[PDB]
């Protein structure tokens, strides 16, 4: 309070120091931030946002962003203080640090509820944020793309109108800058955009970004691969044409590489989920996935005790969604000896529907001794596996 | 001669309302075609993040 | 004769062989197959679908594998939709042959002659022949409308 009292009338450096105090206090826990809000500091920080020096504006904006980053109600109080248009105006200022701080504050605000993102948008922030993507600054692009990701993550209309500001291929160009967190921000943005409706994913395909995302994933490593795997999985799960777009854009082997070389568990679960969403469609999806040698890896990871629960669950889901349409008998043959009984049913059905309509397939199955294993597989007297074995 | 009407009708009906593949693959090739013309364009600016800051 | 198509045709018609395959025998069923056709620039009859399935279907169940899909794509190449002969199909249903058909006159044909369309397809081809979509078949519009790929 003592710093808040007689603050807007002092010199600039005192305002910057007090805003720094508020930023530091509201950084650790929310309680400090509500205490700052209670002492009537949001209005003073709003007043600090029109000082003729960019330093006071930057300090006040950073304090507001760090205050409005814990929960929703702090951001509610900050927005109710009347700071969103000022944060939008701060970006127009030529100071790169002020632009970065304004974008960071917008990201911190528009990440708790859709209405905060809508309020930031209605202040005309989309048109600006799209205009600083081409700016040659690491941190500025990072914060702009992070704010766009947080805005385009809530509802369909937000992400639709973010794309309406001609954000392509200016964001697609950010996927090969020698910065890495810029690539992560761009991936997060595309993931949040291509998740609501197949129209946005169709438009993102139509911008030529699936290949760019896949190649960026191939050219980098770590947790930055998670948003790309998520966006491509969502695109595959959206419709059939989008899943062809991904498959033709050579996404399945990239998923296999991510599943193999990434030591992390959630990245492997991500790759498994994306593979399952790809292969759950037409049998062409499954044959394209199967020929890339992903099913044995998925089965091994599902049978690996050290694998996490989510990884095993997603691997089993992928196996069930791929083996329910896979027609490639040479890919389905190894499952006869290493798949569990609750997975062998799909393989036996796939065989019972392939074999009656291919003589060479039956010849190779007999010469490989797969029918003996099928006979060695039990079934319930009445379950679908019984009729599948009978058809075999 | 009626068999002639229905073939074309059943064709373009699928193309327009259901789905068109001549709308898909040409663009899916344009996906790889555009990536070449996307990259250097603002790699020049990615390297001008150098030529302005580095 | 499962070796008819060329590489461009194989690639173009393989990933469309896909988009409607759901039975999954390395093959596709009848109507999914027609949808695969009709999304590939060409517009086959309901009769051509069966004539060119049965001839190459080594199984006889109406499902065609991709190697036989090569044969049937190539035959549909040979059955490339002749633009003028559907326009000719319209001057004898419309016995005057002036260029314009009412929806009722042509529907009297699409319900008694050839592959009798369902009334949904008939109404939508009314909307597609009559771009306004009121019930007046302009087949000098309908034909090059369907030529669009």
Q: Please report the DSSP string for A172-189 in residue order.
A: GGGGSSS-SHHHHHHHHH
Sign of CA dihedral A289, A295, A296, A297: positive
Breaks (C-N over 2.5 A) in chain B follow: none
DSSP state of C64: E
Closest approach of chain A CAs to the CA of C13, in angstroms? Answer: 12
Domains C6-79 and C80-146 share a fold: yes
A269-308 CB burial, b ≥16 within 10 A, e <16: bbbbbbbbbbbbbbbbbbbbbbebebbebbbebbeeeebe
Q: Which residues in chain A touch residue C17, judged by CB atoms under 8 angstroms apart?
A: 284
Q: Would you say A194 and A176 are in contact if contact means Cβ atoms under 8 Å apart?
A: no
Cα B30 from Cα B26, distance rounded (Å): 6
Specify the DSSP element, H or E, that contains C119: helix C119-129
CB A257 within 8 A of CB A216: no
Give how far A365 is from chain C: nearest CA, Å. Answer: 16
Helix (H/G/I), strand (E/B), else coil: A107: helix
Q: 3-state DSSP call for residue A7? A: coil
Question: Which of B19, B41, B49 is nearest residue A136 as measured by Cβ atoms?
Answer: B49
* C51: CB partners within 8 A, 6+ apart: none
Phi/psi at C102 (5° precision): -75, 155
Under a CB-based contact definition with an 8 Å cutoff, are residues A164 and A153 in contact?
A: no
Q: Judging by beta carbons within 10 Å of its beta carbon (0-12, 13-18, 19+), is residue A2 exposed, middle or buried?
A: exposed
Strand C136-138 relative to strand C100-102, pairing? antiparallel
State whether residue C148 is helix, strand or coil: coil
3-state secondary structure C66-111: HHHHHHHHHHHHHCCCCHHHHHHHHHHHCCCCCCEEEHHHHHHHHC
Nearest to A354 among C18, C26, C61 (CB): C26
Strand C100-102 with C27-28, pairing: unpaired
B43 to chain C, closest Cα gap in Å: 33
Which chain C positions have a beta carbon within 8 Å of A244's beta carbon? 15, 18-19
Give the 3-state secondary structure of residue A170. coil
Check: CB of residue B17 under 8 Å from CB of residue C50: no
Q: How far is the C-alpha of A256 from the C-alpha of C100, rounded, in Å?
A: 58
Beta pairing partners, C137: C101
Q: How many CB atoms lie within 10 A of CB A228?
A: 32
Helix, strand, coil percent values for chain C (each to nearest 5): 55, 5, 40
**C114·B19 Cβ contact <8 A:** no
- Residues A320 and A305: their CA atoms lie apart, in Å, by 19
Contact C15 B21 (CB under 8 A): yes
Q: Which of 3.40.50.170, 3.40.50.720, 3.30.460.20, 1.10.238.10 is the CATH number of C6-79?
A: 1.10.238.10
Candidate from A178, A206, A241 with C-beta closest to B46: A178
| Chain A 172-231, residues with CB within 8 Å of chain B CB atoms | 172-174, 176-179, 205-206, 208, 210-212, 215
Distances (CA, A) of A157 to A88, A147, A162, C126: 20, 16, 8, 35
The superfamily (CATH) of domain C80-146 is: EF-hand (1.10.238.10)
- For residues C102 and C136, the answer to whether their CB atoms sit within 8 Å is yes
Tell whether omega for the bond before A359 is within 30 degrees of 0, i.e. cis.
Answer: no
Size of interface B-C (CB pairs under 8 A): 114
* Cβ contact, residue pair B16, C128, below 8 Å: yes
Residue C49 near residue C73 (C-beta atoms within 8 A): no
C63 is in an annotated binding site: yes
Distance CA C10, CA C74 (A): 10
Q: Are the C-beta atoms of C144 and C131 separated by less than 8 Å? A: no
Residue among C145, C136, C141 at smallest CA distance from C106: C136
Please, are residues A288 and A247 in contact by the beta-carbon 8 Å criterion? yes
For chain B, report the end-to-end CA distance as a whole number of angstroms.
Answer: 74
* Distance in angstroms (rounded) separating the CA atoms of residues A30 and A57: 22
Structure solved using which method? cryo-EM
Q: Where are the alpha helices (DSSP H) in B1-54?
A: 2-13, 25-46, 48-52
Q: For the stretch C7-31, what's the b/e string if a residue is b when 16 or more beta carbons lie within 10 angstroms of its beta carbon?
A: eebeebbebbbbbbbebbbbbbbee
Tallying the residues shown for chain B, one arrives at 54
**At a CB cut-off of 8 Å and minimum separation 6, what does A184 contact?**
A223, A224, A227
Of residues A242, A224, A220, the one with CA closest to residue A233: A242
Please report, for chain C, the start and end positions of each structural domain, with discontinuous segments joined by +. Answer: 6-79, 80-146
With CB atoms and an 8 Å threshold, state whether B46 touches A215: no
C121 is in an annotated binding site: no
C124: Cβ–Cβ under 8 A, 6 or more apart, which residues? B13, B17
* Chosen from C39, C92, C105, C106 to mutate, greatest number of chain B CBs within 10 A: C39
The whole-angstrom separation of Cα C105 and Cα A330 is 56
CA A183: distance to chain centroid? 12
Give the closest-approach CA distance of C96 to chain B in angstroms. 16
Distance between CA A134 and CA B47 in Å, rounded?
12
Residue C64 β-bridge partners: C28
User: Quick one: resolution in A?
Assistant: 7.7
C42 secondary structure, DSSP code:
-
Burial-class residue C40 by CB neighbours within 10 Å (0-12, 13-18, 19+): buried
Nearest CA in chain C to B23: C149
- Residue C29 is given by DSSP the state -
Instruction: Please report, for residues A201, A338, C20, C140, the alpha-carbon distance to residue A156 in angstroms, rounded to integers and kept in the order given.
Output: 12, 43, 28, 42
Task: Give Cα A375 to chain centroid, integer Å.
Answer: 45
**Phi-psi bin for A2: left (phi > 0), alpha (psi -120 to 50), beta?**
alpha
d(CA B32, CA A166) in angstroms, rounded, equals: 20
- Could you give the CA distance from residue A282 to residue C17 in angstroms, rounded to a whole number? 10
d(CA A328, CA A272): 19
Rg (CA), chain B: 22
Enumerate the residues of chain B whose CB falls inside 8 A of the CB of residue C93: 2, 5
Beta bridge partners of C65: C27
Whether residue C130 is annotated as binding a ligand: the answer is yes
Residue A27 to residue A32: CA distance in whole angstroms: 8
Q: Considering only CB atoms, which chain A residues are within 8 Å of C21? A: 282-284
What is the rounded distance in angstroms from the CA atom of residue C114 to the CA atom of residue A82? 71
Choose among C69, C87, C16: nearest CA to B9.
C87
Contacts of B43 in chain A (CB under 8 A): 173, 176-177
Phi-psi region of A88 (alpha: psi -120 to 50; beta: other; left: phi over 0): alpha
Burial class (CB in 10 A: 0-12, 13-18, 19+), A20: middle
Residues A315, A321, A327, CA angle at the centre, nearest 5°?
A: 115
Q: Does B54 touch chain C (CB under 8 A)?
A: no
- Any A CB within 8 A of B45 CB: yes
Inspect the interface and report whether the beta carbons of A244 and C18 lie closer than 8 Å. yes
C102 bridge partner residues: C136
C-alpha–C-alpha distance, residues A291 and A273, integer Å: 18
Least Cα distance to A286 among C14, C110, C18, C144 occurs for C18
CA C4 to chain centre: 20
Which residues of chain C lie closer than 8 angstroms to A247, CB-CB?
15
Handedness of CA A222, A228, A234, A235 (dihedral sign): negative
């Amino acid at each position: 309070p003592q710093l808040v009292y007689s603050l807007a009338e002092q010199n600039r450096f005192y305002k910057k120091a007090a805003a720094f105090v508020l930023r530091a206090v509201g950084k650790h826990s929310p309680q400090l931030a509500q205490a700052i809000v209670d002492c009537g500091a949001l209005d003073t920080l709003v007043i600090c946002l029109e000082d003729f020096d960019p330093g006071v504006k930057e300090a006040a904006a950073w304090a507001l962003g760090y205050i409005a980053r814990h929960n929703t109600e702090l951001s509610q109080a900050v927005v109710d203080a009347g700071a969103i248009p000022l944060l939008v105006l701060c970006i127009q200022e030529p100071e790169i640090a002020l632009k970065r701080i304004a974008a960071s504050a917008l990201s911190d605000i528009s990440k708790h509820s859709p209405e905060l993102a809508q309020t930031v948008v209605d202040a005309g922030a989309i048109a600006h944020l799209a205009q600083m993507i081409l700016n040659p600054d690491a941190k500025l692009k990072r914060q702009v793309l992070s704010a766009l990701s947080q805005i385009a993550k809530h509802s369909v209309d937000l992400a639709e109108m973010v794309v309406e500001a001609e954000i392509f291929p200016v964001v697609l160009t950010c996927l090969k800058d020698k910065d890495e967190y810029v690539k992560k921000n761009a991936c997060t943005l595309i993931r949040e955009i291509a998740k609501h409706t197949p129209e946005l994913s169709q438009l993102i395909v139509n911008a030529g970004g699936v290949a760019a995302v896949i190649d960026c994933i191939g050219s980098c490593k770590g947790n930055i691969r998670l948003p790309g795997i998520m966006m491509l999985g969502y695109v595959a799960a959206h419709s059939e044409n989008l899943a062809m777009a991904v498959i033709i854009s050579k996404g399945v082997p990239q998923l296999s590489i991510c599943l193999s070389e990434e030591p992390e568990d959630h990245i492997k679960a991500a790759a498994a989920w994306a593979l399952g969403q790809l292969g759950r469609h037409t049998p062409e999806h499954a044959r394209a996935v199967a020929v890339t040698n992903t099913l044995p890896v998925l089965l091994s990871l599902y049978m690996s005790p050290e694998s996490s629960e989510d990884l095993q669950l997603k691997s089993k889901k992928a196996i069930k969604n791929i083996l329910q349409k896979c027609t490639y008998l040479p890919a389905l043959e190894p499952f006869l000896y290493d798949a569990p009984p609750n997975i062998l049913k799909h393989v036996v059905g796939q065989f019972s529907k392939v074999l009656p309509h291919d003589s060479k397939a039956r010849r190779l199955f007999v010469t490989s001794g797969g029918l003996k294993k099928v006979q060695e597989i039990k079934a319930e007297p009445g379950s679908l596996l019984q009729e599948y074995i009978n058809s075999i | 001669m009626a068999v002639r009407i229905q073939r074309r009708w059943r064709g373009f009906r699928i193309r327009k309302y259901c789905f068109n593949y001549y709308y898909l693959k040409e663009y899916l090739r344009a996906v790889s075609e555009t990536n070449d013309a996307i990259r250097e364009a603002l790699e020049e600016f990615a390297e001008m993040k150098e030529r302005e800051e580095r | 004769m499962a070796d008819q198509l060329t590489e461009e045709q194989i690639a173009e018609f393989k990933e469309a062989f896909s988009l409607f395959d759901k039975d999954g025998d390395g093959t596709i069923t009848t109507k999914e197959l027609g949808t695969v056709m009709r999304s590939l620039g060409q517009n086959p009859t309901e009769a051509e679908l069966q004539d060119m399935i049965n001839e190459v279907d080594a199984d006889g169940n109406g499902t065609i594998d991709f190697p036989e899909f090569l044969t049937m794509m190539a035959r549909k190449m040979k059955d490339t939709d002749s633009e003028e002969e559907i326009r000719e199909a319209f001057r004898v249903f419309d016995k005057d042959g002036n260029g314009y058909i009412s929806a009722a006159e042509l529907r009297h044909v699409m319900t008694n002659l050839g592959e009798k369309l369902t009334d949904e397809e008939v109404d939508e081809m009314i909307r597609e022949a009559d771009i306004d979509g009121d019930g007046q078949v302009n087949y000098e519009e309908f034909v090059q409308m369907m030529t669009a790929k």
